[PDB]
Design a protein around this ligand. Structure first.
Ligand code: NAG
Ligand code: NAG
Lengths: 99, 105
């Protein structure tokens, strides 16, 4: 075709180095962090990862903000549906707007 | 302030800088357990005040989260909210009332 900009930059002595960590290693780190915070709660960031059920971790996280834990256990389907709708709206927000 | 659960920190001097000695709390030896979110006793649902419900295989105990010391499930360390047909995963266990034997004398 024609002369590219990057070929001119390479021919004039300007070189772009590649990063040390690939995208696959970044994705592996992100997946490990997600799995740790999903299964073990916050205990994996302070030593050994201690497993817990997720509803009981959710009860602790409501307890930390000042709401008693019986609010979650009596309404757990509503928190589940609200979380599902909230994480589903991020998909429709990111699939259309590019700003 | 360091890695772990923070307790203190001790500053130290250095050439062109400062050195901190963070003191932290690290849990060491864990063992695995069976747990339930709540206790159905006498048609009422019991939730712990602080801590967690654990089972050693036969009985049900209450203990704190960051350490393992088992205690008997009591009315003093539990509170009642609703009936045992809404909470998912509720089990059956007796609840000790300290007021009844002090009444019966
Ligand atoms: C407890 O049980 C789980 C499930 O089998 C097992 O993976 C784990 O090694 C056991 N021990 C501890 C200390 O968690
Ligand atoms: C707990 O007791 C109630 C009535 O006493 C009974 O209906 C229920 O099935 C019991 N729970 C289990 C897990 O068996």
């Amino acid at each position: 075709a024609a002369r590219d900009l990057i070929c001119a930059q390479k021919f004039n002595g300007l070189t772009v180095l590649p990063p040390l960590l690939t995208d696959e290693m970044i994705a592996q780190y992100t997946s490990a962090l997600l799995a740790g915070t999903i299964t073990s709660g916050w205990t994996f960031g302070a030593g050994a990862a201690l497993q817990i059920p997720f509803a009981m971790q959710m009860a602790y996280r409501f307890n930390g903000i000042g709401v008693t834990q019986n609010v979650l256990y009596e309404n757990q389907k509503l928190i589940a549906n609200q979380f599902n709708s909230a994480i589903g709206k991020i998909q429709d927000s990111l699939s259309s707007t590019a700003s | 302030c360091g890695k772990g659960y923070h307790l203190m920190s001790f500053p130290q001097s250095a050439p062109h800088g400062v050195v901190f000695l963070h003191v932290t709390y690290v849990p060491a030896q864990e063992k695995n357990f069976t747990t339930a979110p709540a206790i159905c006793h006498d048609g009422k649902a019991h939730f712990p005040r602080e801590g967690v419900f654990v089972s050693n295989g036969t009985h049900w105990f209450v203990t704190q989260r960051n350490f393992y010391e088992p205690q008997i499930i009591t009315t003093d360390n539990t509170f009642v909210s609703g009936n045992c047909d809404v909470v998912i995963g509720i089990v059956n266990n007796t609840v000790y009332d300290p007021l009844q034997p002090e009444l019966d004398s």
